[PDB]
Design an enzyme around this catalytic site. Structure first.
Site, PDB file in Angstrom:
ATOM      1  N   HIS A  14      39.821  33.394  41.473  1.00 47.39           N
ATOM      2  CA  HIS A  14      39.134  32.402  42.289  1.00 47.39           C
ATOM      3  C   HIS A  14      38.563  32.983  43.560  1.00 47.39           C
ATOM      4  O   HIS A  14      38.035  32.224  44.376  1.00 47.39           O
ATOM      5  CB  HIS A  14      40.052  31.212  42.603  1.00 47.39           C
ATOM      6  CG  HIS A  14      41.166  31.508  43.560  1.00 47.39           C
ATOM      7  ND1 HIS A  14      40.969  31.643  44.919  1.00 47.39           N
ATOM      8  CD2 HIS A  14      42.502  31.617  43.364  1.00 47.39           C
ATOM      9  CE1 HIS A  14      42.132  31.858  45.512  1.00 47.39           C
ATOM     10  NE2 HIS A  14      43.079  31.844  44.592  1.00 47.39           N
TER      11      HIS A  14
ATOM     12  N   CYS B 138      46.283  35.117  49.134  1.00 50.41           N
ATOM     13  CA  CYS B 138      46.097  35.227  47.691  1.00 50.41           C
ATOM     14  C   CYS B 138      45.817  36.668  47.314  1.00 50.41           C
ATOM     15  O   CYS B 138      45.101  37.385  48.020  1.00 50.41           O
ATOM     16  CB  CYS B 138      44.953  34.346  47.196  1.00 50.41           C
ATOM     17  SG  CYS B 138      45.161  32.580  47.513  1.00 50.41           S
TER      18      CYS B 138
ATOM     19  N   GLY C 270      44.284  33.338  52.806  1.00 49.91           N
ATOM     20  CA  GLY C 270      44.020  34.756  52.759  1.00 49.91           C
ATOM     21  C   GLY C 270      45.113  35.581  52.118  1.00 49.91           C
ATOM     22  O   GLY C 270      44.876  36.756  51.804  1.00 49.91           O
TER      23      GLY C 270
END
EC number: 3.4.19.12
Lengths: 305, 305
Positions: free
Chosen positions: A41, A145, A143
């Site tokens: 994503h 991820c 952030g």
């Protein structure tokens, strides 16, 4: 002596964290050989996340749409593919700091260390358990991820988790490094139910052994129990049922302490039914379930890497 | 979101850990530039530890009696000297992996990360607080001496702790990197009284702020109290007094949450006088006092290194 929640040393993973930027989205990637792994994503805007069609979105991207940064050096993306929920960005430089590694899919109840990163630089390290409902209770800001979870076996880094999202309930969900989610979760910003969480019984028992080894003995009774009666009490308190495989895992700790597994089980039964009555165990006023039997032995034996 | 006891990434410290052997004793040392720092009791046998004369014991040692090993590489000792309770071994090569670093003496109540090591190899990493009585509650098996504690600011490693011993009560004691013990302790195996421990009030307040930020709010009342009134209750419950300095340190958390420090104090007062009644805050059934206000702010903004 002493017993702490302890993470693996993070140096081998620190050398693999890079920054991956796609448009307005920046998160962390894992740079191993000439491939950078990151949550797919990263190709999504915040509006995209509500209902992304990932294949359509990825088709809109070319290699030059991915800004990959290792320290201050930019890596050159020469290929991109999607494997389940991870992107694999082929780059032209093999990470010279690539450690010996494996990708592994862990089981509920197993633990790992998380190297929480932001903008590709490591921020902190902590130890997590994969909850029985396949969430983790971590610390993940926007952030984070692409931060990974891992275990180390001397010199081999077994990567087992990549962080993808925070559920509306504030718990965390992610994939193995082949991009398959742990649990029923999808990488879409939509209400998602995590099932009922349960306590990891075999871990609690291992931690009670850890406590005895470190001198906390008060909860020990000379009662015993059958595996069946215990599991009947266990299920009333949302404890995972204990199996013979679990009894077998606890063998070494039983042997070191002289406390048969089913004797420990009787002491745990009593703790659930009568509470801890204001005293503590290893400095905790709750029963801890984030130490595997392997973690206890490792910490109590001094395994290094 | 989420809130975890989080250690600093340890990679910069890993590259400094070496094995120091002297006679039959092996522990860890810290290799910075061309100097290896280790506990001076590396020169002691177990029976020396009962009553060591460190000057006399060190006079019997030569440079070649000190085996220093960095991974597989053998370092050549070309000088040795004792500074307080640390031995400084001059080696012929500067550690190419020396980070930017400082030696710092921290205050009681400040936190740091420990990289626990055995035979010069990193084993685990965890976060510790210097107790008000200058002990730490770590996890240190035989061979962990010389393991260090540190904080990191972007690229600078502030070494603040080197581990030297376990007191007969199971708590741990050590020195700064100039070899000065924290607390009234000495590097001798004798009964040694630690002060009355106390709870780090400012840290408890910081952790309550972290809880409010994470949505744990049940403990908020709308009462206020005074600094003297709070401190009256604090003393009864063996909490460190709260000073204006501490109120000042909590300012940014007070400002982000809209909860005045003296209001949070009133909530804490009520938790002290009424117990937690079996409820939990941030997944803990006790008041946690091992997060500084800086730790809290850091985890809720995502500082990196």
């Amino acid at each position: 002596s002493g017993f702490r929640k302890m993470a693996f040393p993070s140096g081998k993973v620190e050398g693999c964290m890079v920054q991956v930027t796609c448009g307005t989205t920046t998160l962390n990637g894992l740079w191993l050989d000439d491939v950078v792994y990151c949550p797919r994503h990263v190709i999504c805007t915040s509006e995209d996340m509500l209902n992304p069609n990932y294949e359509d979105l990825l088709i809109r991207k070319s290699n030059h749409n991915f800004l990959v940064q290792a320290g201050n050096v930019q890596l050159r993306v020469i290929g991109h593919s999607m494997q389940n929920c991870v992107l694999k960005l082929k780059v032209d430089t093999a990470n010279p700091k690539t450690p010996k590694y494996k990708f592994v899919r862990i089981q509920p109840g197993q633990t790992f260390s998380v190297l929480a990163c932001y903008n590709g630089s490591p921020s902190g390290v902590y130890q997590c358990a994969m909850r029985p409902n396949f969430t983790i209770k971590g610390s993940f800001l926007n952030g984070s991820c692409g931060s990974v979870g891992f275990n180390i076996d001397y010199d081999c880094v077994s990567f087992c988790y990549m962080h993808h999202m925070e559920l509306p309930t504030g718990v965390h969900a992610g994939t193995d490094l082949e991009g398959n989610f742990y649990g029923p979760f999808v990488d879409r910003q939509t209400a998602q139910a995590a099932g009922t969480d349960t306590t990891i019984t075999v871990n609690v028992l291992a931690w009670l052994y850890a406590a005895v080894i470190n001198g906390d003995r008060w909860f020990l009774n000379r009662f015993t129990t059958t595996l069946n009666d215990f599991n009947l009490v266990a299920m009333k308190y949302n404890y995972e049922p204990l199996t013979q495989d679990h009894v077998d895992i606890l063998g070494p700790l039983s042997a070191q302490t002289g406390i048969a597994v089913l004797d420990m089980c009787a002491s745990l039964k009593e703790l659930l039914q009568n509470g801890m009555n204001g005293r503590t165990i290893l400095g905790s006023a709750l029963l801890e379930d984030e130490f595997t039997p392997f973690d206890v032995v490792r910490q109590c034996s001094g395994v290094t890497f």
